[PDB]
């Protein structure tokens, strides 16, 4: 048997994607319908966002 | 009472019932326009400010829904 030498090194990570969501809109006085599509009709506009 | 006083009163009534009345429509027609422009002119200042600051158009609206750093 004769001499010998070697080395090794590795780096890796596992995948795991995901998704997040969030909605919201402008607050109004006297509008209990907290929905992105306000079905009421007070007298203003609600841009909303989802 | 006599007829002289009654006839004089009747004549004075007819005399007073003769005052002319000129036109009075152009006055209001002009006052309405003098107020419309005076009310809707100052919006140009806000329009120019919003267009020169940085925000784009479209978002510029009317009403009373507060303000933020994007919409006017």
UniProtKB/Swiss-Prot annotation, chain A:
Taxonomic source organism: Pseudomonas phage PP7 (Bacteriophage PP7)
Assembly and binders: Interacts with the host pilus.
Parts of the chain that traverse the membrane: none
The protein's role, per its UniProt record: The maturation protein is required for the typical attachment of the phage to the side of the bacterial F-pili. Binds to sequences located toward each end of the genome, hence circularizing it. The RNA genome-maturation protein A complex is released from the capsid upon host receptor binding. Maturation protein A enters the cell along with the viral RNA.
Covered range of the whole protein: 52 to 101 of 449
Family classification: Belongs to the Leviviricetes maturation protein family.
Subcellular location(s) per record: Virion
Source species, domain of life: Viruses
Protein's recorded name: Maturation protein A
From Swiss-Prot, chain B:
PTM-bearing positions, type N-methylphenylalanine: 1
Compartments where located: Fimbrium; Cell inner membrane; Host endoplasmic reticulum membrane
Description of the deletion phenotype: Mutants show a significant reduction in the efficiency of extracellular protein secretion. They are also defective in twitching motility.
Record PTM text: Methylated by prepilin peptidase PilD at the amino group of the N-terminal phenylalanine once the leader sequence is cleaved.
Effect of residue 1 to C: Loss of processing by PilD
Subunit structure: Interacts with itself to form a multimeric tubular filament structure with a diameter of 51 Angstroms. Interacts with PilJ. Interacts with PilS at the inner membrane. Interacts with type II secretion system (T2SS) components XcpT, XcpU and XcpW. (Microbial infection) The ssRNA phage PP7 infects P.aeruginosa O1 (PAO1) through the retractile type IV pilus (T4P). PP7 binds to T4P by interacting with a single pilin subunit PilA through the Pilus-Interacting Region (PIR) of the phage maturation protein (Mat), and is brought to the cell surface through pilus retraction powered by ATPases PilT and PilU. Then Mat enters the cell envelope, causing pilus bending and pilus detachment, which impairs cell motility and restricts the pathogen's virulence.
Family: Belongs to the N-Me-Phe pilin family.
Protein name: Type IV major pilin protein PilA
Classification of source organism: Bacteria, Pseudomonadati, Pseudomonadota, Gammaproteobacteria, Pseudomonadales
Range of the intact protein held here: 7 to 78 of 149
